[PDB]
Design an enzyme around this catalytic site. Structure first.
Site, short mmCIF file in Angstrom:
data_model
loop_
_atom_site.label_atom_id
_atom_site.label_comp_id
_atom_site.label_asym_id
_atom_site.label_seq_id
_atom_site.Cartn_x
_atom_site.Cartn_y
_atom_site.Cartn_z
N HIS A 459 47.40 78.47 -26.91
CA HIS A 459 46.15 79.23 -26.78
C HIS A 459 45.94 79.49 -25.30
CE1 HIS A 459 41.97 80.38 -27.59
NE2 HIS A 459 41.60 79.49 -26.64
C1 LIG Z 1 40.20 76.26 -16.00
C2 LIG Z 1 40.71 75.71 -17.31
C3 LIG Z 1 41.67 76.39 -18.00
C4 LIG Z 1 42.17 75.93 -19.23
N1 LIG Z 1 43.08 76.71 -19.89
C5 LIG Z 1 43.51 76.27 -21.06
C6 LIG Z 1 44.45 77.06 -21.79
O1 LIG Z 1 44.86 78.15 -21.42
N2 LIG Z 1 44.92 76.52 -22.98
C7 LIG Z 1 44.43 75.35 -23.50
O2 LIG Z 1 44.86 74.98 -24.62
N3 LIG Z 1 43.56 74.60 -22.82
C8 LIG Z 1 43.11 75.03 -21.66
N4 LIG Z 1 42.19 74.26 -20.96
C9 LIG Z 1 41.74 72.97 -21.50
C10 LIG Z 1 40.73 73.09 -22.58
O3 LIG Z 1 39.58 73.79 -22.07
C11 LIG Z 1 40.33 71.71 -23.09
O4 LIG Z 1 41.51 70.94 -23.46
C12 LIG Z 1 39.35 71.76 -24.27
O5 LIG Z 1 38.19 72.55 -23.94
C13 LIG Z 1 38.92 70.37 -24.68
O6 LIG Z 1 38.14 70.44 -25.89
P1 LIG Z 1 37.17 69.25 -26.24
O7 LIG Z 1 36.82 69.57 -27.67
O8 LIG Z 1 37.83 68.00 -25.76
O9 LIG Z 1 35.95 69.54 -25.27
P2 LIG Z 1 35.28 70.85 -24.62
O10 LIG Z 1 35.87 72.05 -25.27
O11 LIG Z 1 35.36 70.60 -23.14
O12 LIG Z 1 33.79 70.66 -25.16
C14 LIG Z 1 32.97 69.61 -24.58
C15 LIG Z 1 31.51 70.00 -24.67
O13 LIG Z 1 30.71 68.80 -24.58
C16 LIG Z 1 29.52 69.12 -23.92
N5 LIG Z 1 28.96 67.86 -23.47
C17 LIG Z 1 29.48 66.98 -22.55
N6 LIG Z 1 28.74 65.91 -22.42
C18 LIG Z 1 27.71 66.08 -23.34
C19 LIG Z 1 26.62 65.28 -23.73
N7 LIG Z 1 26.39 64.08 -23.22
N8 LIG Z 1 25.82 65.74 -24.72
C20 LIG Z 1 26.07 66.94 -25.25
N9 LIG Z 1 27.06 67.79 -24.97
C21 LIG Z 1 27.85 67.28 -24.00
C22 LIG Z 1 29.88 70.15 -22.85
O14 LIG Z 1 28.76 70.95 -22.55
C23 LIG Z 1 31.00 70.94 -23.55
O15 LIG Z 1 30.49 72.13 -24.15
C24 LIG Z 1 41.67 74.71 -19.75
C25 LIG Z 1 40.71 74.00 -19.01
C26 LIG Z 1 40.16 74.52 -17.86
C27 LIG Z 1 39.10 73.74 -17.12
#
Ligand SMILES: Cc1cc2nc3c(=O)[nH]c(=O)nc-3n(C[C@H](O)[C@H](O)[C@H](O)COP(=O)(O)OP(=O)(O)OC[C@H]3O[C@@H](n4cnc5c(N)ncnc54)[C@H](O)[C@@H]3O)c2cc1C
Ligand SMILES: Cc1cc2nc3c(=O)[nH]c(=O)nc-3n(C[C@H](O)[C@H](O)[C@H](O)COP(=O)(O)OP(=O)(O)OC[C@H]3O[C@@H](n4cnc5c(N)ncnc54)[C@H](O)[C@@H]3O)c2cc1C
Ligand SMILES: c1ccc(CN2CCC(n3cccc3)CC2)cc1
Ligand SMILES: [Br-]
Ligand SMILES: [Mg+2]
Ligand SMILES: [Mg+2]
Lengths: 483, 486
Positions: A459
């Protein structure tokens, strides 16, 4: 002179067979072709159709055509430049393509020079007898003898040739062969045919056409690209239209005459008329067997004129084989190559092997392109009691911003719903030809839909759609569509 | 205020778990996030890091950056235009990205409203107790309670956050979060770090820089993109250099000071200096555990800081699970999504399933890009007695015409030479990320090198190179690299 193998046609299949027999199995090999480099008068040459007047030059020209979309689409991502300064210089494209094809011609020349036991003969090959190939000055069998080649084994690998309809004014029309050598880009062009060559050339000409130009594609049937996925046929029609191509379906030329300025006056069977600068006939390709004098040895042809072969590429005459388009099956370079390798392994290696003509990945370098492997649903539905269709169709995000909101990516997986075995994968959109390749490996491994949806996505990609489909969009049960 | 599942973090992992639980198993779900749409002050929002300040905007901006190459490369194919008229309007790009991300934010709002038993709660999730999540107005645990949520099951999915090195002048530096909202493209920029985020942004900045602009990427060790194939690491380095990006390896900022004109004076550990308009730190991301108040229920963290999980995403505390970047393993959206779908298919579907963390297809949207799946050879070589490497590397023909002769396409297949099993596939060049997806499926099916070479090529593609390799370029035998087997 005496050879273990004589190959007539130094093309995709012929060169694979000759090189493998010479290098892998240490055979003395002769290879015959009518030209050492690309273009008029014979168009195909050393390297074959794909090198000279097919896949290689057309792909470069489609790449060239794609910049018309990139230049326009760049604006959505904030690129600015003087739009009125933009010119599509076809002369530069043709010169760049010519140099590329000539370099390949030259390397193949060097390959014959540097490969001992692999010899090239220039001229027209035909069968004198079941163990003698004669090479002559011309296609006329009364032309001068340049060589007589004694052959334990003879491979017919002369490929195919454009079909031209016997209509009044056919002489004022060209095929893909001439399209590669147009010195100037036509302002108005009709591509005749609904196949990949017509559609790919419509896109090429649409990009390079001079100001106020117009590309028209005509086809007898109701929907272009028969044999492809029907959703993709409808979508590629829409997306060609959106980029300024006039798709005239249920239409066919009846005759062509010259207007007083030398432009072509086309009368369609419907009585409609069209004035264009070029008429490009892309209505089919026929096996090249006329010139082989196969009557001399009694090799069995079909009424169409293809060499009849068994699964091991063997004619009815022992020690005489046919591979590639001449056999009128799948007209693809990699199939030709696969048949050539399988033949040589079978005959000279005693390593019996037949080409699998099912689940062959292929592409159409339309704008945007198609990638496909395996059965379309209508075909699957006749062969399997229950068929599932998994379909994702959506304008990708980059194309909302680009301004090309018409560019729907289509991904479809067809399954045997009784066990989930993937029968077909059909893609439309940027990347599709690149995505479908490893899908060919999946279908060789009898991948199921569970194997796709349990694989983790890359992705963001268009390809990840294939690994994100859990639930059928619809079914066929005993040939009946059930939404 | 009673739910089967409460999810803290409406991100990649959190929403897959939430939506699945509700729609597949008619379960009652609460999802908590700090913000409903992208950008300052909290950056991540409804949809998560990937949607708001990650994969989705980054990919749009790399696509924007690619037009610098396409506009130049078009000339080889006969495209003519006034090269002196070309301008890269960063503000247009950021405005278009912002609209695209907001529409996704709104699309997720619609999902929550149009879905029975799936409810969004705005504010900061922490653990009161085993079966209660408190939503507070701020990250301060002392702030007002907005809600108290009864949870038969708790999912931690709070993702990660940029690490900023504790150097003098770090306050003059940005992360990727602020990179997405720069009002103007920097003339001079230092991207700090050797990972995908630094590399992708160096590409973006390189394309949008104003005239006389310069992109410098620094990396503390010798070779960027640790964990990627070594050939590809060296090649990307060359191809970034060829496109005007300066790669400073074995270099690391010791401090930053403001110059009187608002520009940044970077002093390296080596003593070197560099004046830039932006310092973007991309040296690591760290899981977001602090704000959940995990001490309150004793959820175990790792010697690194991530929530410790078993293979079923289970913490040491029953009914409490953790997926995605908070677990500090593979920080990828589709991994987070996979863990979420498995957790829910396990616990509510009564169909236990474990995410496979091996043979994961991933990409770097470098220019040109990487697509990779499975083991690099150095890793294979320590696990397997005999490893074969198949390599094809050449500038494709279109790039001899384009004038980008430096864009070598690299295809490597790493196998267990004892049975031909493909252990990894590593690609550098246009379309690599698109090519590698169906390679992920092939690896799931235990594809051998012979399954690739016996598959008929699609011609002409870069992809067909993968079906054209029959003979190893070299081997590892008991860890030792050699051209030929004994
Ligand atoms: C610049 C960048 C580029 C990237 N490019 C890619 C890519 O091309 N391909 C890929 O696969 N991955 C990519 N990633 C990584 C990807 O974004 C993450 O692996 C993914 O978003 C993680 O998903 P998650 O469900 O762990 O958390 P996230 O998607 O980070 O969701 C976490 C959420 O929790 C919320 N939150 C945090 N603490 C609290 C709290 N205490 N109470 C309520 N809400 C809270 C935040 O607001 C956030 O919305 C990239 C990351 C970055 C920073
Ligand atoms: C416009 C176009 C686009 C195409 N695009 C693609 C594509 O993108 N991908 C793809 O896979 N396929 C493509 N094809 C199909 C592909 O080119 C053919 O399937 C392939 O070249 C067939 O290989 P072959 O060995 O059968 O014969 P060819 O490669 O055609 O070789 C036959 C050779 O025999 C020579 N010859 C003929 N008669 C004689 C004689 N009597 N004596 C001596 N020499 C003789 C010819 O000069 C020619 O060089 C395309 C075809 C065309 C026309
Ligand atoms: C084709 C491709 C690339 C260029 C170089 N210019 C890119 C855009 C820059 N720019 C940004 C804002 C104002 C100008 C200047 C350099 C020229 C032609
Ligand atoms: Br039809
Ligand atoms: Mg020789
Ligand atoms: Mg709801």
């Amino acid at each position: 002179k005496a050879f273990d193998l004589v190959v007539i046609g130094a093309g995709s299949g012929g060169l694979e067979a000759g090189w493998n027999a010479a290098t892998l199995y240490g055979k003395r090999v002769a290879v015959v072709d009518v030209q050492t480099s690309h273009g008029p008068p014979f168009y195909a040459a050393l390297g074959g159709t794909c090198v000279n007047v097919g896949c290689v030059p057309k792909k470069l020209m489609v790449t060239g055509a794609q910049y018309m979309d990139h230049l326009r689409e760049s604006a959505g991502f904030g690129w600015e430049f003087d739009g009125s300064s933009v010119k599509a210089n076809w002369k530069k494209l043709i010169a760049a393509k010519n140099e590329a094809v000539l370099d390949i011609n030259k390397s193949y020349e060097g390959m014959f020079n540097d490969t001992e036991g692999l010899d090239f003969f220039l001229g027209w090959g035909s069968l004198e007898s079941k163990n003698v190939v004669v090479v002559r000055e011309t296609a006329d069998p009364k032309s001068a003898v340049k060589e007589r080649l004694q052959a334990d084994h003879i491979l017919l690998a002369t490929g195919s040739w454009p079909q031209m309809p016997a209509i009044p004014g056919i002489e004022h029309c060209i095929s893909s062969n001439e399209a590669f050598y147009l010195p100037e880009p036509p302002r108005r062009v009709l591509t005749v045919g609904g196949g990949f060559i017509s559609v790919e050339f419509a896109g090429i000409f649409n990009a390079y056409k001079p100001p106020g130009g117009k590309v028209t594609l005509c086809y007898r049937n109701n929907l272009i690209l028969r044999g492809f996925d029907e959703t993709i046929r409808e979508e590629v029609t829409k997306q060609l239209t959106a980029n300024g191509i006039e798709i005239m379906t249920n239409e066919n030329p009846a005759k062509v005459s010259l207007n007083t300025d030398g432009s072509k006056h086309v009368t369609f069977e419907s009585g409609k008329t069209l004035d264009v600068d070029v008429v490009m006939m892309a209505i089919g390709r026929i096996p090249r067997t006329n010139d082989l004098q196969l009557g001399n040895v009694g090799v069995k042809l079909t009424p169409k004129g293809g060499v009849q072969v068994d699964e091991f590429s063997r004619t009815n005459v022992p020690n005489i084989y046919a591979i590639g388009d001449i056999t009128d099956r799948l007209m693809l370079t990699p199939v030709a190559i696969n048949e050539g390798a399988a033949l040589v392994d079978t005959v000279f290696g005693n390593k019996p092997r037949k080409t699998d003509h099912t689940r062959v990945a292929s592409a159409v370098f339309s704008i945007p392109p198609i990638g496909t492997c395996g059965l379309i649903e209508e075909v699957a539905a006749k062969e399997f009691e229950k068929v599932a269709v998994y379909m994702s169709s959506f304008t990708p995000l980059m194309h909302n911003i680009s301004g090309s909101k018409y560019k729907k990516f289509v991904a479809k997986i067809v399954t045997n719903h009784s066990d989930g075995t993937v029968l077909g994968v059909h893609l439309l959109g940027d990347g599709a030809p690149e995505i479908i390749q490893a899908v060919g490996v999946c279908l060789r491994l009898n991948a199921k839909i569970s194997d796709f949806y349990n694989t983790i996505g890359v992705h963001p990609t268009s390809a990840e759609e294939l690994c994100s489909m859990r639930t059928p969009s619809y079914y066929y049960v005993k040939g009946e569509k059930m939404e």
